[PDB]
């Protein structure tokens, strides 16, 4: 029988620069979000995996092209996973686990950004399943 | 009369790093705390000053000496200050204001280390008039050097 | 192509009470935690619902029975939901959303228990799909 | 002798009973401040100073409440050796002012969770209040 369980959820790395600060608040609010996302998976112990969801957000206010902020995040989870065939295992490490972390990472980004008094940045969903399919293509590609 | 009013408390830079997860979680919680603190100031308007409070902490474990986490914060706020003798002004800026900012950067610190799922880290109350004092204590030598140019 | 988008994560209500302070800090920390959680939906706009996640936590200390803290949080959202079959939709409403809201409500609880200077309280993952299934075992009960 | 031993919240509330049917309007705020202080001896030269703050923002013209925040920020202070009245000043002006900035980011923090516009409470003349006390 297969097993997928979370052992711990924790941040491995956080960041939130907002340079041209004191002033930028004068300019008018017209964003240019520069999302990006990734996931790495390190095996730790027998049947234990660290799935890390890497995320970079970067509002940019069009005309000026001057950064409004750059939030980066590494939300991780250690999981116990066993009894899965190669492809399933890959859906776990690539969509299942990342998908469960995602919402914690969303809250983080939302919390930081909020600390810079900026306007709410509640990250929109990601389709991890697609990401899985894409993951599979990339692997056959390389092979 | 004299005027002090908060315009906007806000963050300008925050980072947090916990380089030894998860393996470190298995070690005995023997915390060693590094904690440097500092303040800066900048006028950005007519009676508009933006004070910055920097904080850096770093925990290591007694036994292995490994690093548990590093967190750096730059809490800032912009204020409207006016009608003060140069001496008052300096207190306001090196103490009064940074003081106002302290809880904000404190919470952020507690917040982040808790996301590392490490034991609480609630910075102890800081004496801000102290910094003012160090500020004064530095003048004489600084003015001397300033004069030497 | 369906539609799921977030319009506003926000708190409708939150309460934190620590009634036996500072005396309680003299007791040994032997916690017995009570946890309760529920959900509510409400169409507000046209393809716009305010999903609410209610969480209530209480902790007493075992030797004295005294209350260390009680905390209640109403974390809400307002989302744009469209183009979903009756099943997918009620799932989205009763599970998928409340889930997105979980981290927000969680952080709030840990944040407040920490201002009371009590040991950390980081709510463990909640299984909303399970609560979703029971939601159905209640409707069908009719 | 005067030193802070522990800083903590005894009670906190924050209700915004008109969401999300207001995020659509603009700001026409009418803050409703109120503030108390209570001290209690809890031990040998140990006093619990409690700073009570209420802030009921009512959006004027509409009349409805935008939110009601009620914080009890407190602290346990070791305090000894003070002439009768000069003590009062400690327990009613000195200590509270020490707690206020914590009571401030708390109120900010909540308000910011209600998505409303940043509410960074304004400075309170704690000595001036002390006067209207002895009366």
Burial string for C2-24 (b: 16+ CB within 10 Å, else e) reads: eebebbbbbbbbbbbbbebbbeb
d(CA A4, CA A91): 12
Q: What is the per-residue DSSP string for chain C? A: --EEEE---EEEEEEEE-TTTTGGGGS---EEEEEEEEEE--EEETTEE--EEEEEEEEEETTT--EEEEEEEEEE--EEEES--HHHHHHIIIIIHHHHHHHHHHHHHHHHHHHTT-S---PPPP-HHHHHHHHHHHHTT-
Q: Is the dihedral of CA C63, C67, C69, C74 positive or negative?
A: positive
* CA-atom Rg of chain D in angstroms: 17
Cβ–Cβ below 8 Å for C122 and B114: yes
Which positions in chain A touch D115 (Cβ < 8 Å)? 120
What contacts 24+ positions apart, CB below 8 Å, involve A33-42? A33/A57, A33/A58, A33/A59, A33/A60, A33/A121, A34/A58, A34/A59, A34/A60, A35/A123, A37/A126, A39/A93, A39/A94, A39/A98, A41/A93, A41/A97
Taking Cα atoms as reference points, which of D118, D121, D76, D123 lies closest to residue D97? D123
Token pair 């399919």 in the structure block, residue: A133
- Residue A126 burial by Cβ neighbours in a 10 Å radius (0-12, 13-18, 19+): middle
Cβ–Cβ below 8 Å for C21 and D113: no
Q: What is the resolution of this structure in A?
A: 2.5
Token pair of D100 as six digits: 């206020």
Token pair 């299984």 in the structure block, residue: C127
Token pair of A103 as six digits: 């919402």
d(CA C12, CA C41): 13
Q: In this structure, are residues D4 and B125 in contact, taking their beta carbons and an 8 Å threshold?
A: yes
d(CA B77, CA B7): 7
Residues linked to residue B71 through DSSP beta bridges, in sequence order: B16, B57
- The SS3 assignment for B144 reads helix
Cβ–Cβ below 8 Å for D76 and C22: yes
List all residues 6 or more positions away from B64 whose beta carbon is below 8 Å from its beta carbon. B27
List all residues 6 or more positions away from C87 whose beta carbon is below 8 Å from its beta carbon. none
Q: In this structure, are residues C59 and C67 in contact, taking their beta carbons and an 8 Å threshold?
A: yes
Q: How many beta carbons lie within 10 A of that of residue D114, not counting itself?
A: 21
d(CA C15, CA C73): 6
Please check whether residue D11 touches C, CB under 8 A: yes
- CA angle, C59 then C64 then C70, to 5°: 20
Find the residue in D nearest to B100 (Cα).
Answer: D101
Find the residue in D nearest to C48 (Cα).
Answer: D20
Determine if the peptide bond prior to A64 is cis (ω within 30°): no
Please check whether residue C42 touches D, CB under 8 A: no
Please check whether residue C80 touches A, CB under 8 A: no
d(CA B105, CA B56): 10
- Domains by residue range for chain A, with CATH: 1-143 (3.10.420.10)
d(CA A38, CA A16): 18
Please check whether residue D23 touches C, CB under 8 A: yes
d(CA D108, CA D125): 20
Distances (CA, A) of B96 to A94, A102, B99, B122, D121: 50, 40, 5, 21, 15
- Phi first, then psi, for residue D99 (nearest 5°) are -80, -35
- The SS3 assignment for D92 reads helix
Token pair of C10 as six digits: 């926000």
Token pair of C97 as six digits: 């959303």
Instruction: Compare CB distances from A44 to B13, B22, B115 and report the shortest one's residue.
Output: B22
List all residues 6 or more positions away from B72 whose beta carbon is below 8 Å from its beta carbon. B13, B14, B15, B16, B54, B55, B56, B57
Q: How many beta carbons lie within 10 A of that of residue B119, not counting itself?
A: 13
Q: Residue D63: left (phi > 0), alpha (psi -120 to 50), or beta? A: left
d(CA D35, CA D126): 11
d(CA B126, CA A45): 43
List all residues 6 or more positions away from D68 whose beta carbon is below 8 Å from its beta carbon. D13, D14, D15, D16, D54, D55, D56, D57
Q: In this structure, are residues A39 and A117 in contact, taking their beta carbons and an 8 Å threshold?
A: no
List all residues 6 or more positions away from D126 whose beta carbon is below 8 Å from its beta carbon. D92, D93, D94, D96, D97, D100
Residues linked to residue C116 through DSSP beta bridges, in sequence order: none
């Amino acid at each position: 029988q297969p097993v997928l369980q979370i052992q711990r959820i924790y941040v491995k790395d956080v960041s939130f620069e907002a340079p041209n600060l004191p002033h930028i608040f004068q300019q008018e609010w017209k964003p240019k979000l520069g999302f990006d996302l990734s996931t790495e998976t390190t095996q730790v112990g027998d049947d234990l995996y660290e799935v890390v969801l890497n995320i970079s957000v970067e509002t940019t206010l069009e005309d000026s092209g001057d950064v409004a902020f750059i939030c980066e995040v590494k939300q991780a989870g250690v999981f116990t996973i066993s009894g899965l065939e190669d492809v399933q295992m890959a859906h776990c490490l690539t969509s299942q686990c990342p998908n469960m972390l995602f919402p914690y990472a969303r809250e983080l980004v939302s919390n930081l950004v909020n600390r810079g008094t900026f306007p709410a940045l509640n990250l929109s969903p990601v389709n991890f399943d697609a990401l899985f399919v894409e993951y599979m293509n990339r692997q056959q590609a390389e092979n």
